Amino acid sequence: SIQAFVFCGALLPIGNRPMIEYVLDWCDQADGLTSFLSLRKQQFELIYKALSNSNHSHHLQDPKKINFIPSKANSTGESLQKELLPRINGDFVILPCDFVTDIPPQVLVDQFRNRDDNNLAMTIYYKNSLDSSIDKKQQQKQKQQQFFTVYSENEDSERQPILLDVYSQRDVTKTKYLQIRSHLLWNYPNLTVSTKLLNSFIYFCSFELCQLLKLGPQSMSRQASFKDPFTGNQGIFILPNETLFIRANNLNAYMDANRFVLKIKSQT
Amino acid sequence: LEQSFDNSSLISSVKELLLNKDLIHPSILLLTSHLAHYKIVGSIPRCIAMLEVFQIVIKDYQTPKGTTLSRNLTSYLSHQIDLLKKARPLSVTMGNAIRWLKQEISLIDPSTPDKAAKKDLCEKIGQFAKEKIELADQLIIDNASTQIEESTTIVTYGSSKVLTELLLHNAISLKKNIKVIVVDSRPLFEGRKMAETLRNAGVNVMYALITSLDTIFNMDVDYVFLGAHSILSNGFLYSRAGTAMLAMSAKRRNIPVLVCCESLKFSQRVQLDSVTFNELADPNDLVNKNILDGWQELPSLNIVNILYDLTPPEYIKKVITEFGALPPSSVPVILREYKGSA
Amino acid sequence: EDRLQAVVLTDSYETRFMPLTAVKPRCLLPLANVPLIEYTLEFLAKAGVHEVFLICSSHANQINDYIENSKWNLPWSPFKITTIMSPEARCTGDVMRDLDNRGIITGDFILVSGDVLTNIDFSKMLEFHKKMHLQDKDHISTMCLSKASTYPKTRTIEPAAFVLDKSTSRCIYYQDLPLPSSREKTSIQIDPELLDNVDEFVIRNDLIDCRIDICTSHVPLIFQENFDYQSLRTDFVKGVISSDILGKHIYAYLTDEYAVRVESWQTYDTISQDFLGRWCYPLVLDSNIQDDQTYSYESRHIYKEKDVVLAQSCKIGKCTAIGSGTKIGEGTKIENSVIGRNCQIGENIRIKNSFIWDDCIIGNNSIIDHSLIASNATLGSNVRLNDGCIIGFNVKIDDNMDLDRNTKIS
Amino acid sequence: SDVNVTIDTFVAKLKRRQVQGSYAIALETLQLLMRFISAARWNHVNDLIEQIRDLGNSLEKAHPTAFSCGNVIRRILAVLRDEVEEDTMSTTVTSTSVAEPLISSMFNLLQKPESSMKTKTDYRQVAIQGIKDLIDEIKNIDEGIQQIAIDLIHDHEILLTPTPDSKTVLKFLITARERSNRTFTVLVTEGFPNNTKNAHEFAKKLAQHNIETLVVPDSAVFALMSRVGKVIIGTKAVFVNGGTISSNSGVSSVCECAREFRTPVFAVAGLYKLSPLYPFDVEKFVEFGGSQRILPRMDPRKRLDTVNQITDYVPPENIDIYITNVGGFNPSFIYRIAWDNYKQIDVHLDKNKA
């Protein structure tokens, strides 16, 4: 069934709990949120785990296999392909390094339930939240994302919205200036893209370890370039998905996690 | 309050369970998730889909230590049926399969090493729907085709269950001329699935709504065929809501009406009133800022949505099953001769 | 607010209908037994206008005499009607600038290019345009378009792809989508420098073009000195938004229901059947306004006038339309096709998906499929047809003539 | 003239549905009619009926299926068609007044031989009050409705209407709860998908006056018909058979389903909702709608066909009573009220008297 997996890549945790730990019991808060197991690298685990294995009367069944090579020593796209053939059990869920939230994944695995659209991966994301102001930092490093934003107002078709391609600043907007293949436009041709869409790295997954074996998706680094090719005829192949929401959650990507915990994440 | 059919307690709106004593199959929650949020079934689609998850869930046996496989699965499978009862109460297409399945739980002995437990059950429960459904539907095909001439019309109601395959056979596999009249109703537009399919099949389809029903009958029209949900012991057709209004009108407008059905869709129970034994389904559905909101919290307002309703058997002219055709008063004589006997 | 000016221009698609159009304009051609001048004119009679301005770059003499035989030269029409003669090949926009050099047009006014047909209200379009006035002084216009939802790639001649704003619906850029059967030219380009103050914006395809735009009189003066623009949206709506002029906001508008414009015969194939069906609600055929017709409605979309001689044993199928002066014979078949007024139908002819116009005599045993026939073109015996026969005006056809696909004969 | 363009914009008012309903078009065809009365120079009393019969044929041929405008012009002719015979025999000496309103209509065509002295102007001003008394009748038709229907209906029975788009019973069931303090309920269905705009509007205002109401879907109305034993139908127009031209959608088959359970079927109609014409074809009065709101996908390549209907017709065998301002009446009695308001000449309202 559902399986967890955590990636990794100042380091001192500010909000009175370890940075690495914030996805351990948070993804398994109640019954429902129970995956099969979670996996992690070493990351000097003795400080982390000895406090993480405290207060035990709760059947904390924690197996955790350790590697070292997909830990910024190798690209986590191609290196993960060999790291799944003993790891496969059923459906997959990956986790980013230091994710935080407010609304629990109990309603996010509810989004994984009613997925009879023979999907292979849905991606629950969110944009930027309400920031401070016109900041005293550098310019807006905007990840220009290439996707379909709002829900489909059409029955039976892309009933959750679709991520189509994936790019950012400095790759296309500074070389080819936002060019899109009109061929990949032809499937669901009424798209909407945004700029503040924070790649939440959550990435509900499925049995494409049985079906990644054809050539073309095997050269994928960064774990998103599978619908970045249209993968069709010059019919269409399998489909991705994407989901987001309105308010009342968190995450962190940048060095602003020092100030995310200051005024936004206060706990009482 | 004078009829008090709002206080007819055939269903509630209870949800939100958390119990984990049983090892609940995750995929059978998906079946209940696929029903109650947006209904995607007829009755024999359920009888397929209820069987689709049953072959999977028996394959994960998980038989405990001091318990015979005859002793646990009569609790294990039946505990998962109550998950469906929270979503949607059963049909006879549900009902006749599961009591037949509970026979097969009981007729096994403590001898199976659980490797043999697949194929004595798997092909047997496969030969159930191979015989009771599939080639049962094959005998529907030849029987209805000889009762239909070329260049005529068919009036159906809602999404059909078996006569979709009958209309495919006479339009394509026999190529005789035919015009199709599919009518469905607010809220469940399940007849549009047929309206997609038969014009994808390339045949003359005239879609319709039940409010405009007279002007269909004011044209060249005959051969009203119907889907079904169960047949009462009298001859009443317990079927989808709005079936009887065309069944009274076409019988009033002296053109015959048939009900495509099968022996699996018979029943031992009997009644003669529409609002006695039924099911309500989430009164929010008949709304779509909307026009009104607040059937709750407002004084003197309620939304009903009848799912099932009876038709008098005098409206039905001929009842066709896989064994053949029969007049509608002669329904319960198969209950002593084939159902549990054949 | 008041004084709803307008500008009506035909005569841009003479390239499109060249086997026809040698004797009469495209706008004079009968859609359903009646032309499509008045489809627009009654639609801007719904607009509540005060004056129009015609453009007749060709066939100019046979325009106004039809208006002299219309109700529009008779003083209870919503507008007085004015025409402007012109020589041939006077393209769009250059018709505007010479009219702008004349400069009659004041304030807001109505661009109708091509020949349109719709059901959209004039009301909710216009306060939306006034909402742009209350949100911007550097505004340009509001381009109302429909949503061809279930069908991409069957907007026949040109596929148009639009990118616009989420909130303000400001059209970001236009780039023409290539031919969808051509799988080669697979790239669009939108320069992101002008994408500053939107950051959530919608890029679509299914906005079917109808060229129905209304705008103020300032933007043709903007269009005046920029004399190197030759089209409406192929060049000008790009260049006004591709950063060359600074701070100019054109909007579009989407509606959830019917609006369309004729491009080819394939557009003339579809929307004729859509108008013959109830897809043109409420603008329906039994209204009988224009040549004050006598059509009576019957079920399965039957449009019969009076004086209709229906013979015995001739089945009339769905989606048909029959004028007066007509006589069908025994054993014929009428299905899914309009029939011209004042015509003759012989014995055992299967008219199917073919738009036969007025004063046509069809010989016996000559079935017609996907083959519309213009005025005064009779036939003979055993004249078999197929797809795309767009045979023209006053064409004598002898016996036994079978034809091939796309027979554009005259 | 100036009245000749106000009729043209009224001709324009009746093309593209610039007014709807059986109420407002009758007031507005009649206020506009007084402009034609005040600017007419007939010079003979048979010219003035010629001044108005072509105007109706400039109106009924312009749009047939509206009738609240179509029956006024015959009735306001009939008040002058009465007074032609008033000044005819009062001009003569021998048999000035017999004054019995009914002569045997069979024999009258079958016997053919071949102070206010004249006061020719009075046909204008008696039509000027003929303008006024018609509208003032229309303003309070509901008092003759409410005088007889609470007599006809009783207290403790569940009810049903298929016509939420009837401002009569929208206003009537207020005072049917208010003055008469009878408690009951009303089932209400939708005119799908057209009166469901007003069907949700209908029971909400009745929820304000809290008459135990609940909305049923259109498919369920057979399944609860066994409980209810009384239905009322707010119609739009009514013809000489007692077959009435009803409101928009869904109401005919449920009027049929009511009749099959031997349930009495009620109707309300103003006196100006009468029409002296005959329903020759049912389908020439059954108006349809659009393919838009019955399925919105608009497929051009699959492209099935579908049928809407914004007029239902019922036979008089499916109806029982006519709650009117002047009493309740048989379905077959409708001629005698009508021929006390209309004449045999202008029912064939056409210049060609063929």
UniProtKB/Swiss-Prot annotation, chain A:
Q: List Phosphothreonine occurrences by residue.
A: T231
Question: Where is the protein situated, by its record's location annotation?
Answer: Cytoplasm, Cytosol
Chain positions with Phosphoserine modification:
S221, S225
The similarity comment for this entry is: Belongs to the eIF-2B gamma/epsilon subunits family.
What's the subunit arrangement here?
Component of the translation initiation factor 2B (eIF2B) complex which is a heterodecamer of two sets of five different subunits: alpha, beta, gamma, delta and epsilon. Subunits alpha, beta and delta comprise a regulatory subcomplex and subunits epsilon and gamma comprise a catalytic subcomplex. Within the complex, the hexameric regulatory complex resides at the center, with the two heterodimeric catalytic subcomplexes bound on opposite sides.
What's the further remark here?
Present with 9530 molecules/cell in log phase SD medium.
Q: What does this protein do?
A: Acts as a component of the translation initiation factor 2B (eIF2B) complex, which catalyzes the exchange of GDP for GTP on the eukaryotic initiation factor 2 (eIF2) complex gamma subunit. Its guanine nucleotide exchange factor activity is repressed when bound to eIF2 complex phosphorylated on the alpha subunit, thereby limiting the amount of methionyl-initiator methionine tRNA available to the ribosome and consequently global translation is repressed.
Name of the protein: Translation initiation factor eIF2B subunit gamma
Coverage span on the entire protein = 2 to 415 of 578
Curated annotation (Swiss-Prot), chain B:
Q: What are the protein's UniProt keywords? A: Acetylation, Cytoplasm, Initiation factor, Phosphoprotein, Protein biosynthesis, Repressor, Translation regulation
Q: What is its main location?
A: cytoplasm
Q: Which GO terms describe its molecular function?
A: enzyme regulator activity; translation initiation factor activity
- An example Gene Ontology biological process: cytoplasmic translational initiation
Query: Which locations, inside or outside the cell, does it occupy?
Result: Cytoplasm, Cytosol
Please give the GO cellular component terms listed in this UniProt entry: cytosol; eukaryotic translation initiation factor 2B complex; guanyl-nucleotide exchange factor complex
> In which family does this protein belong, per the annotation?
Belongs to the eIF-2B alpha/beta/delta subunits family.
Q: Give the multimer and partner information.
A: Component of the translation initiation factor 2B (eIF2B) complex which is a heterodecamer of two sets of five different subunits: alpha, beta, gamma, delta and epsilon. Subunits alpha, beta and delta comprise a regulatory subcomplex and subunits epsilon and gamma comprise a catalytic subcomplex. Within the complex, the hexameric regulatory complex resides at the center, with the two heterodimeric catalytic subcomplexes bound on opposite sides.
User: Further notes on this entry?
Assistant: Present with 10300 molecules/cell in log phase SD medium.
Q: What is this protein called?
A: Translation initiation factor eIF2B subunit delta
Source species of the chain: Saccharomyces cerevisiae (strain ATCC 204508 / S288c)
From Swiss-Prot, chain C:
Give the record's GO CC terms. cytoplasm; cytosol; eukaryotic translation initiation factor 2B complex; guanyl-nucleotide exchange factor complex
Q: Where can this protein be found?
A: Cytoplasm, Cytosol
Q: Show the GO MF annotations.
A: guanyl-nucleotide exchange factor activity; translation initiation factor activity; translation initiation factor binding
Quick one: where is this thing mainly located?
cytoplasm
Keyword annotations: Cytoplasm, Initiation factor, Phosphoprotein, Protein biosynthesis, Translation regulation
Instruction: List GO BP terms, alphabetically.
Output: cytoplasmic translational initiation; regulation of translational initiation
Additional observations: Present with 33800 molecules/cell in log phase SD medium.
Subunit details: Component of the translation initiation factor 2B (eIF2B) complex which is a heterodecamer of two sets of five different subunits: alpha, beta, gamma, delta and epsilon. Subunits alpha, beta and delta comprise a regulatory subcomplex and subunits epsilon and gamma comprise a catalytic subcomplex. Within the complex, the hexameric regulatory complex resides at the center, with the two heterodimeric catalytic subcomplexes bound on opposite sides.
Stated family:
Belongs to the eIF-2B gamma/epsilon subunits family.
Name of the protein this chain belongs to: Translation initiation factor eIF2B subunit epsilon
Native species: Saccharomyces cerevisiae (strain ATCC 204508 / S288c)
Q: Give the stretch of the parent protein shown, with its full length.
A: 24 to 433 of 712
Swiss-Prot record, chain D:
Tell me one Pfam family matched here. IF-2B
Instruction: Enumerate the subcellular locations listed in this protein's record, separating them with semicolons.
Output: Cytoplasm, Cytosol
Keywords of this entry:
Cytoplasm, Initiation factor, Protein biosynthesis, Translation regulation
Xref: InterPro entries: eIF2B_beta_subunit, IF-2B-related, IF_2B-like_C, M1Pi_N, NagB/RpiA_transferase-like
Show the GO cellular component annotation of the record.
cytosol; eukaryotic translation initiation factor 2B complex; guanyl-nucleotide exchange factor complex; mitochondrion
Name where it mostly resides: cytoplasm
Q: Show the GO MF annotations.
A: enzyme regulator activity; translation initiation factor activity
Q: Which GO terms describe its biological process?
A: cytoplasmic translational initiation; regulation of translational initiation; translational initiation
Task: Determine the domain of life of the protein's source.
Answer: Eukaryota
What is the role of this chain?
Acts as a component of the translation initiation factor 2B (eIF2B) complex, which catalyzes the exchange of GDP for GTP on the eukaryotic initiation factor 2 (eIF2) complex gamma subunit. Its guanine nucleotide exchange factor activity is repressed when bound to eIF2 complex phosphorylated on the alpha subunit, thereby limiting the amount of methionyl-initiator methionine tRNA available to the ribosome and consequently global translation is repressed.
Which PANTHER family would you find in this protein's record?
TRANSLATION INITIATION FACTOR EIF-2B SUBUNIT BETA (PTHR45859:SF1)
Family, per the entry? Belongs to the eIF-2B alpha/beta/delta subunits family.
In the UniProt entry for this protein, what further remark is given in the free-text comments? Present with 6650 molecules/cell in log phase SD medium.
List the protein's name.
Translation initiation factor eIF2B subunit beta
Q: Which organism is it from?
A: Saccharomyces cerevisiae (strain ATCC 204508 / S288c) (Baker's yeast)
